[PDB]
Amino acid sequence: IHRIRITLTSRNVKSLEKVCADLIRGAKEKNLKVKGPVRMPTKTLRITTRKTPCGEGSKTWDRFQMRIHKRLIDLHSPSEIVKQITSISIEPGVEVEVTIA
Amino acid sequence: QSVQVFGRKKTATAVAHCKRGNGLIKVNGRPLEMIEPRTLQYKLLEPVLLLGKERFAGVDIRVRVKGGGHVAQIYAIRQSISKALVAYYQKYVDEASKKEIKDILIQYDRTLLVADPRRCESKKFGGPGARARYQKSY
Amino acid sequence: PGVTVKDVNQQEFVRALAAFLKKSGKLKVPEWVDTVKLAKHKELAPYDENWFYTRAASTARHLYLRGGAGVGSMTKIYGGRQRNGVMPSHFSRGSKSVARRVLQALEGLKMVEKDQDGGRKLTPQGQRDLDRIAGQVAAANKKH
Amino acid sequence: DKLNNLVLFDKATYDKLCKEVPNYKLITPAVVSERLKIRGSLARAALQELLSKGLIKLVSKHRAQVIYTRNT
Amino acid sequence: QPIKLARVTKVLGRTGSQGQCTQVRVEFMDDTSRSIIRNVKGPVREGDVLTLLESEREARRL
Amino acid sequence: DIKLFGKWSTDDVQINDISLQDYIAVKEKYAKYLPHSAGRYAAKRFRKAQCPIVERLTNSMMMHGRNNGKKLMTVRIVKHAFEIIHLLTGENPLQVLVNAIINSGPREDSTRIGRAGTVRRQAVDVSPLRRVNQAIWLLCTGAREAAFRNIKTIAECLADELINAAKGSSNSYAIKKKDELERVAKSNR
Amino acid sequence: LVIPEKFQHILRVLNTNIDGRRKIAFAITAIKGVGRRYAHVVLRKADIDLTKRAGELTEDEVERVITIMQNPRQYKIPDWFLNRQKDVKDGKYSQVLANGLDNKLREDLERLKKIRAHRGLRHFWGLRVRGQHTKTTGRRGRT
RNA sequence: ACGAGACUCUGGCAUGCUAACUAGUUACGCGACCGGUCGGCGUAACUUCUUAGAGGGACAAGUGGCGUUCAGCCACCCGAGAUUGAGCAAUAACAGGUCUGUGAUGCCCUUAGAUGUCCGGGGCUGCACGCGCGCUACACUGACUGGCUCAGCGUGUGCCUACCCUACGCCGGCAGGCGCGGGUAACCCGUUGAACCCCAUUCGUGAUGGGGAUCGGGGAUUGCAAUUAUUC
């Protein structure tokens, strides 16, 4: 089968959407039937940390939250074409997992 | 046909599929006369007998429910039924009696059409609850 | 239109499936059924002498509702409030052995069949018996 | 403290109980226990037994609210 | 202990040590010509009617 | 029809307070088949009076850190004693309820009044809203203490207190509280 | 079987007197080991109706209950379900009724002090067995 | 001008719009009723039903009563919404705690006689009592046989990291042995079937069933080392 799946994950929604638009245009630059970007639920990671290094004062905490936004682009094409589209200076912080089955 | 327009309360929701059927209202494989709490059945028969049991003349309404809490599902299941009745009565048939029944159930209450925007707030640290704080030490 | 499985109060429906069970006289009861603790969150011994048959009825009814669901899931349904006195009460699992024994009791009697990806399903004979029971309770008052 | 109540079967559950509960208009295990000097637990047990005999009209049942009224 | 009617027409203000009462102006319906002042306790709506033991009472006035 | 619980008629109530039906209402269009509509009136002001008073009851005999979060139990327990007053007095429970709300409802209270003194109290008029609030509070306090640790169950202690407060009988704990309020109003002019 | 008049205040253990006001499945809690779910299960499998009360407590009931509490293997009940499994200082497996024989086993304070064991010294002063840490906090004992 | 406000995520209407095969209800039989009803699901499949995108929307904008008639305040109809909650928070300062947080650090004991450092066998693991955050309750709005059945953030097999969740057969009440596998993840548990409640069981004013808070034995899984049955 030639259905190549890009599991692309990044911390920024705007950079993620720019990557997705560029990738889907590069697919749209060629003759490749594609599906729309599939947005899996963003992982919200919570870390609640006491602020004072030594326990003193009012009970105060910081709440660091990590938003991880993940799109999938599965296109009906050999992975070589997708790699040809890939060399476009991918946005930093956007990681790509390649799925071939 | 799917003229469903939500019908919600808290985080639980109902979708009222409506068609030209038998006039029997179904709630996920069980009749509205038999619901798990065994206590809010009147809250479910309120809309139909308030507007009139005679209105249903061959309309099959299946509501599918999903969300947390039984009573939270109610006030939305019945809201979904009222929404489906509104959609059916707006699609083809007149509006004068539609406005009549709408005025009657609006003066009856407000939670039959418009959803309650309320929701459970977060809890703030430094206390047992969102607004409650711990006891002062002297 | 006939009779559907869920159109009669489910409490009396499980009671009627239990009644079918104790008029059938088919099941088997082992000899460790009163010497065990049989529960974690239940603090008193059963006073009904017949909890095995009602357990079988509940298991069969849940079996119709759930496909591919096997041992270990009903014991979470049978678990509940475990109070430790001063300790705040928690949710504790019920008795896995009781559920497994009642399952093996119903297992192989054409009510419960073994699937091929894990868990269990019901045979058409068991479904027909359950539907006949549901029709019985419906015709008791709801179909007349 | 001290648990001491009537646990004896004598002319208190049949006589003056089956002869004074039917003649009253409100019948409750608490009402029967209070107005007829009887134990509420045995009041419930005897009310269940006489309901099995079939000499009352039941509206609804609960752990603390079993609603009876005169029928015959 | 005669009892007559009184209904609110002007909420003069809030009184009390910690906002206990409302100094309010009330007219007697049976006479519709007299206005008196009362430190009424509780949430008061402009136009509510209450049955009263008193028909001449006054409180601290400023 | 809009009868309460589908069994108690609502077209029979008479408040007989000339003009008080806007602050004690069971006939109003907000009065529904059940007293359960979830809390929406407490947010704003003078909207609490728009509540169907059946709801105010089922939430006022709903307190004390052991009941909060158990409103379906309160609705079951009001169905109980509604069908019990249906037989005890042989009349609609709404009539005895309005009688209780019209008699137990206080008029005179005593409060600290002044900007510079703390010696004594002054008589004050309790508004209809606060009067129904504290009257229902006294009723519920009695009904809790009347079945507290007692063999008497709910829906009968509440029932007894309601009936002997609705007729104006001073034997009621709520009516004795009303008399105490009136007498302390007398003794602090 | 069923009889309106069998209510007696005393059950026989060692000719001592007990209470007889409690109902069935609760009147045999007067025995040290019997009670809780033990009495519940013996009455449950005793093949009798449990709706009976204190007044309908027959002598045949009491005799069968005494026999069933003598040895647990009437319905194949293991010994650990009783308060005493294999005994200490003797190779028995049963709980003994009355006083002066079972309570003799419980006195466990001297011999562990011979080996300077902590358990015996802890039970010597009447301290805590569950291990309740004691620093200053506690509101029982002297006030 | 800084701060407040504004800002941003949002809670809350997207029936309009890009759009899923890790999402989901309806065109023909799969085991039943002369037309109705399944989370083993029927061939067929549309974004309404969950996620996550752009734009829109709410402004004291509309009416009425007050107001130095202004800034504003109070009522009312529509409307999802007429005060959703929090992080950012000034100038300037403390002799408030932290040198027992730190491979950021100041004369004294420390100059190898090195308050743990390789190995590691006790220590903040003590009993007479004072309102230090809190814990299950004192009961019949209820613990209690069990009937029915509704959750949302999450956390999840891995650098001197076994051990993480965890779908069945056999056994074993109690924890757990091997396997076919399911999981880098909305694919696997999951439809968190859950859990509070939905009141058919002895219960009745108690020392028993509110109140395991006070005894000795035994199976044992991560733990060479549970000695104060520490924890199943």
Side-chain angles (χ1 to χ4, degrees), chain F residues 18 36 39 49 51 95 97 104 123 133 145 175-176:
Chain F
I18 305 196
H36 183 293
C51 190
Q95 302 328 100
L97 174 53
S104 301
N133 295 121
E145 78 196 18
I175 308 299
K176 86 87 163 163

Side-chain angles (χ1 to χ4, degrees), chain C residues 10 13 22-23 43 46-47 49 53 72 80-81 98-99 101 103 106-107 117-118 122 139 142:
Chain C
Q10 294 310 290
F13 177 38
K22 58 261 196 198
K23 78 214 298 313
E43 71 183 286
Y47 212 63
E49 282 91 302
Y53 303 106
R81 278 261 309 270
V98 164
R101 278 310 305 143
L103 182 48
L106 280 173
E107 182 166 299
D117 56 351
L122 79 165
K142 308 217 167 184

Side-chain angles (χ1 to χ4, degrees), chain B residues 2 14 17 21 28 46 51 60-64 72 83 89 94 98 101-104 106 129 132 134:
Chain B
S2 298
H17 226 97
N28 295 83
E46 270 178 50
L51 61 92
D60 222 2
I61 293 180
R62 292 99 141 79
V63 298
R64 93 177 146 288
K83 157 273 289 188
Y89 212 106
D94 79 310
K98 166 82 149 281
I101 74 175
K102 214 64 77 50
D103 295 4
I104 290 165
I106 276 288
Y134 310 122

